[PDB]
């Protein structure tokens, strides 16, 4: 039948791509960075601790000013923090308590949140009256909202559990672009330094690079063994790191179209929940289910430090735009700032 | 110069904190419940007693219960089921090979590393339907389970005067299938509360209320290292 013909036509195309990638693997990243000096032991300490939330924190996002950050806990609250003074700037009661993601607009005027309600709600923080009201509700996803990221005040890309990513247009509430390549639940997404491309990681152990404007899947990155939970672009925009349930982090290169480095240890058997780079991309911070956050040498694949302050599963972690501090969220209601 | 902002920011922070203490009183007073059931099971019939999740609020003896139905979601639960790791109990509605598929789903919920402290309330909601097919020749419980011919009614069984001894043996065999998974991995962290539902009784919220009271009691006994 033609179904077996399409499977055979796809099976050989998989061999054509696999052999084209092997031809480019002339030297690994561990061989190019063999003579560089190690970064040494990284010892960060908990500078701040945020204790406002009443339940497990699922997501957090820094503002572009590196001072304000928004967190999302499943108690039904969206709290905006002043990391310097530890004060709470806003507390937003959510209609649905099962929030799974939160985002901060680069202009600092709006915040987004989504979860099991299958809605991406936008909250205006700069209203004339002063109070924070829900400005828009984006409906159309047939699965839970996993991640959302503002491109600007009027555009936002969302990943959902319906195996689909969507590019929304605020002020109209309509999907302008739909990304349907993935076969499993998309769990994370990361915008490049420019807002023209973004990567997504789904539960099919695969990562896909998307063009925002054209709505096409340019490249597909495999190599993981289990569900990809986290993803983050390199500061230069030519690579990205993924975190999966196979207890490993992997570095993929866009131009090389293959995996470059694997960050794993035998003493690590828990999944990775969050990944983030430094301002220079030399360090790779990953949150684990063992209540700790390991700091990896992105160029040498050697653990450079441990962030063990949290008492429960580290759900989220984010680095400021100036690389000055690292915020980590946990399934304990507390959020810790590291430096 | 900047003391005007650092004081106005500390005033709004205290206004936020006084509101969060009113939320902490409401959030900790209500008990959250996860309603989990297949398609054939009468899951919506339990609610008697599009949206990505359905919320129903009821009150039993001045105690607030917030039950959540997971609708408009795909059958891949391994990612969003981790959100319900702090609920009081997971309501598991089973229809009495849909029975084997429910035994595997309860096995995955029971042995999940994030749901191993979450108790499970079990409801077999097709007792009236099971009572018609067991005494007839279309029960289909002997071919799907060959160890049923070797099974006898337990001594702890409570046979009602309106059910035949075969349905009593049949419904207690299905209950022993779910209790076999609970006893193999139960180490005092979470428990299973199986109940028989004939879908004609409105006393199911009294069973949830009584089972959630046993869960909170066992959680308090565990904090004092008494149980």
């Amino acid at each position, epitope marked *: 039948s033609e179904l077996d013909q399409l499977r055979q036509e796809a099976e050989q195309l998989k061999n054509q791509i696999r052999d084209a990638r092997k031809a480019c693997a002339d030297a690994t990243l561990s061989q190019i960075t063999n003579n560089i000096d190690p970064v040494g032991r990284i010892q960060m300490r908990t500078r701040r601790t945020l204790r406002g939330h009443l339940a497990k924190i699922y997501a957090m996002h820094w503002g572009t000013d590196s001072r304000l950050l928004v967190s999302a806990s499943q108690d039904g609250k969206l709290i905006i923090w002043d990391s310097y003074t530890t004060n709470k700037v806003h507390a937003i009661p959510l209609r649905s308590s099962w929030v799974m993601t939160c985002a901060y607009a680069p202009s600092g005027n709006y915040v987004a949140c989504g979860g099991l309600d299958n809605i991406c709600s936008i909250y205006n923080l700069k209203t004339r009256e002063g109070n924070v009201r829900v400005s828009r509700e984006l409906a159309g996803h047939t699965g839970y909202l996993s991640c959302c990221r503002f491109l600007d005040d009027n555009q936002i890309v969302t990943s959902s559990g319906d*195996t689909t990513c969507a590019l929304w247009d605020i002020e109209t509430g309509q999907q302008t672009t739909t990304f349907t390549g993935h076969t499993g639940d998309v769990m994370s997404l990361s915008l490049a330094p420019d807002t023209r491309l973004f990567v997504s990681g789904a*539960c099919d152990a695969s990562a896909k690079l998307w063009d925002v404007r054209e709505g096409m899947c340019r490249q597909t990155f495999t190599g993981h063994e289990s569900d990809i939970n986290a993803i983050c672009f390199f500061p230069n925009g030519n690579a990205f790191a993924t975190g999966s349930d196979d207890a490993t982090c992997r570095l993929f290169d866009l131009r090389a179209d293959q995996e470059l480095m694997t960050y794993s240890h035998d003493n690590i058997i828990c999944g990775i929940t969050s990944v983030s780079f430094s301002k220079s991309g030399r360090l790779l911070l990953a949150g684990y289910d063992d209540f700790n956050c390991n700091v990896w040498d992105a160029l040498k694949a050697d653990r450079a430090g441990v962030l063990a302050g949290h008492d429960n599963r580290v759900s989220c972690l984010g680095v400021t735009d100036d690389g000055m501090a690292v915020a980590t969220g946990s399934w304990d209601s507390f959020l810790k700032i590291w430096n | 110069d900047q003391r005007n902002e650092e004081k106005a920011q500390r005033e709004a922070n205290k206004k936020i904190e006084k509101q969060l203490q009113k939320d902490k009183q409401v959030y900790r007073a209500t008990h959250r419940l996860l309603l989990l059931g297949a398609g054939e099971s009468g899951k919506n019939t339990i609610v008697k007693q599009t949206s990505g999740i359905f919320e129903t609020k009821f009150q039993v003896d001045k105690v607030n219960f917030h039950m959540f139905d997971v609708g408009a979601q795909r*059958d891949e639960r391994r990612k969003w089921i981790q959100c319900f790791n702090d609920v009081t109990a997971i309501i598991f509605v089973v229809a009495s090979n849909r029975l084997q*598929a429910a035994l595997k789903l309860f096995d995955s919920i029971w042995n*999940n590393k994030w749901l191993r402290d979450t108790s499970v309330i079990l409801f077999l909601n097709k007792q009236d339907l099971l009572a018609e097919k067991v005494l007839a020749g279309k029960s289909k419980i002997e071919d*799907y389970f060959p160890e049923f011919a070797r099974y006898t009614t337990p001594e702890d069984a409570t046979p009602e005067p309106g059910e035949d001894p075969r349905v009593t043996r049949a419904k207690y065999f299905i209950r022993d299938e779910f209790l076999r998974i609970s006893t193999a991995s139960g180490d005092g962290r979470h428990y299973c509360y199986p109940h028989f539902t004939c879908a004609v009784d409105t006393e199911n919220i009294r069973r949830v209320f009584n089972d959630c009271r046993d869960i909170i009691q066992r959680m308090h006994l565990r904090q004092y290292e008494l149980l």
Partner: nanobody, 128 residues
Framework: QVQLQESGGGLVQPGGSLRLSCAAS????????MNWVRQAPGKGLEWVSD????????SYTGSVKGRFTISRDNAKNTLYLQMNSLKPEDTAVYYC?????????????????????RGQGTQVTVSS
């Protein structure tokens, strides 16, 4: 690239025997629990059997208990299913399903309609 290709299968007469093979690649085969699932014509995906990471813990569905035998070879990264005394009710497409996370006792979503980490399946027809 997680890959699962099921070999074997074919047309068997009722009462015969057959051996299904599942070749795995792209992941540490010893760290994962493996499953067998089938889909009868006009029915949904039904769980058949599973086996632990080492091979000690083994479970079957009631219909095939005493007839089917599941075994794994971690050195060869292959899963087996010896199907004895086949009857026409066993006619289905048998899939090799791996549940997603390693070192986990729970084994989720193997019988989902659109589920990754599951092979394309092999046709097993029990006809006269």
């Amino acid at each position: 690239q997680v890959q699962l290709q099921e070999s074997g299968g074919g047309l068997v007469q009722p009462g015969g025997s057959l051996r299904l093979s599942c070749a795995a690649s792209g992941f540490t085969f010893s760290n994962y629990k493996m499953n067998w699932v089938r889909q009868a014509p006009g029915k949904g995906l039904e769980w058949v059997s599973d086996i632990s990471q080492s091979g000690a813990s083994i479970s079957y569905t009631g219909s095939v208990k005493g007839r089917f035998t599941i075994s794994r070879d971690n050195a060869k990264n292959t899963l087996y299913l010896q199907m004895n005394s086949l009857k026409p009710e066993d006619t289905a497409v048998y899939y090799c399903a791996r549940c997603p996370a390693p070192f986990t006792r729970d084994c989720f979503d193997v019988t989902s309609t659109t589920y990754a980490y599951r092979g394309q399946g092999t046709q097993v027809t029990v006809s006269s």
